[PDB]
Amino acid sequence: AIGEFMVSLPRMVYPQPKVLTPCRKDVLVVTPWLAPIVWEGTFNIDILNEQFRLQNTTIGLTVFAIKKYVAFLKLFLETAEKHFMVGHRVHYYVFTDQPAAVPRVTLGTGRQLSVLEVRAYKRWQDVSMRRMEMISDFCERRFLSEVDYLVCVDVDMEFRDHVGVEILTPLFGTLHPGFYGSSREAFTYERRPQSQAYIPKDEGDFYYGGAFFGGSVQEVQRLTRACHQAMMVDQANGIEAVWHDESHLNKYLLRHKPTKVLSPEYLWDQQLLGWPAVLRKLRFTAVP
């Protein structure tokens, strides 16, 4: 459930926070609208685990494994079992055009998997963009009844380290690994004013990655519905945004600020970008 009020914790023994001696001095750990930016060294997972377990929190994790991408499912799910929300209730939702191709993966207690059979679009761009419609539709059909939070990711990925309840909040985006140190002028936003995804050169907080966002079911439903509607307007105007669903996600999160932002620890490509000292952990990485 998502409790209405603050939860009451038991006695716990842990290191005292140090007001005058911050651990992370190398990165921004809070946005200008006071949302935390989640990096290793900013959170005590023991405190957060207690808070979320006291509410019997259930987390849904969506992936789209359409056409040849079914091949990524085995590694995605096996690594998720090792690293994603361990100790909490988890419900995997695999959207696929090939239910028979979903691999057998043994799950820990309190974790389950649903296979959602959906149509495959011809263009990869359309497969990627129609995720928004499909997520929104299923919020109404299944997710509002089944889970408290939804985490929506790309399937061509693997978990390498802890990804846990520190990410949970009403609405989050993730810093795209290619742009976390870039000026907003270098952000690859949609720059064409005719598109619903338009963002001018003098606007933008961050470039968020389309491959990892989430929130409460209600906020995810609203985000995905808004992005799908904006994509349909663009379609009617004969326009396709430069980076598809990611461009629309960026426009949405510019105008509706996320309540947490995840650092690139949560979305990385190690072959392309190596392992900068600013990244103490690589948690969720692209599969070649």
Ligand X SMILES: c1ccc(-c2nsc(N3CCNCC3)n2)cc1
Residue 269 interacting entry, from ligand X, ligand UDP, its own copies, none, C-beta within 5 to 8 Å by type: ligand X
Decide whether 19 or 236 has the Cβ nearer to its own copies: 19
Neighbours of 170 (CB within 10 A): 15
* Least gap, CB of 139 to ligand UDP (angstroms): 18
Q: Which residues pair with 117 in a beta bridge?
A: 96
> Please, are residues 92 and 61 in contact by the beta-carbon 8 Å criterion?
yes
Residue 104 interacting entry, from ligand X, ligand UDP, its own copies, none, C-beta within 5 to 8 Å by type: none
Q: How do strand 260-262 and strand 212-216 relate by DSSP bridges?
A: unpaired
Question: Using CB under 6 A as the criterion, which residues of the chain lie in contact with ligand X when the complex forms?
Answer: 154, 156-157, 177-178, 211, 267, 269, 272-273, 286
Residue written as token pair 């190596």: 274
Tell me the window of 7-15, 65-73, 132-140, 141-149 that interacts with ligand UDP (CB under 6 A).
Answer: 65-73
Decide whether 152 or 217 has the Cβ nearer to ligand X: 152
Q: Compute the distance between CA of residue 255 and CA of residue 223 in angstroms, rounded to an integer.
A: 11
Decide whether 52 or 187 has the Cβ nearer to ligand X: 187
Decide whether 28 or 105 has the Cβ nearer to ligand UDP: 105
Q: Compute the distance between CA of residue 217 and CA of residue 38 in angstroms, rounded to an integer.
A: 21
Residue 65 as a binder of ligand UDP (CB under 6 A): the answer is: yes
Q: Compute the distance between CA of residue 27 and CA of residue 97 in angstroms, rounded to an integer.
A: 42
Residue 37 interacting entry, from ligand X, its own copies, ligand UDP, none, C-beta within 5 to 8 Å by type: its own copies
219 is catalytic: no
Residue 147 as a binder of ligand UDP (CB under 6 A): the answer is: no
> Please, are residues 132 and 154 in contact by the beta-carbon 8 Å criterion?
no
Decide whether 131 or 260 has the Cβ nearer to ligand UDP: 131
Instruction: Supply the angle between the helices 244-255 and 131-138 in degrees, to the nearest 10.
Output: 60
Residue 67 interacting entry, from its own copies, ligand X, ligand UDP, none, C-beta within 5 to 8 Å by type: ligand UDP
Residue written as token pair 């190690």: 270
CA 27 to chain centre: 21
Residue 267 interacting entry, from its own copies, ligand X, ligand UDP, none, C-beta within 5 to 8 Å by type: ligand X
Phi-psi region of 71 (alpha: psi -120 to 50; beta: other; left: phi over 0): alpha
- The answer to whether the annotation marks 100 as part of a ligand binding site is no
- The answer to whether the annotation marks 187 as part of a ligand binding site is no
**Catalytic one among 219, 240, 246, 265?**
246
What is the secondary structure of 10-71 as a DSSP string?
A: PP---PPP-TTS-S--SS--B-TTS-BEE-TTS--HHHHHHHHHTTT-EEEEEEE--GGGGG
**Using CB under 6 A, which residues numbered 202 to 221 contact ligand UDP?**
211
> Please, are residues 24 and 42 in contact by the beta-carbon 8 Å criterion?
yes
Binding residue (CB under 6 A) for ligand UDP from 29, 52, 62, 69: 69
Active site residues: 246
Summarize the annotated binding site as residue ranges. 64-66, 69, 154-156, 176, 188, 246, 269
Summarize the annotated binding site for Mn(2+) as residue ranges. 154, 156
Summarize the annotated binding site for UDP-N-acetyl-alpha-D-galactosamine as residue ranges. 64-66, 69, 154-156
* Contact residues: ligand UDP, CB under 6 A: 63-67, 69, 124, 127-128, 154-156, 211
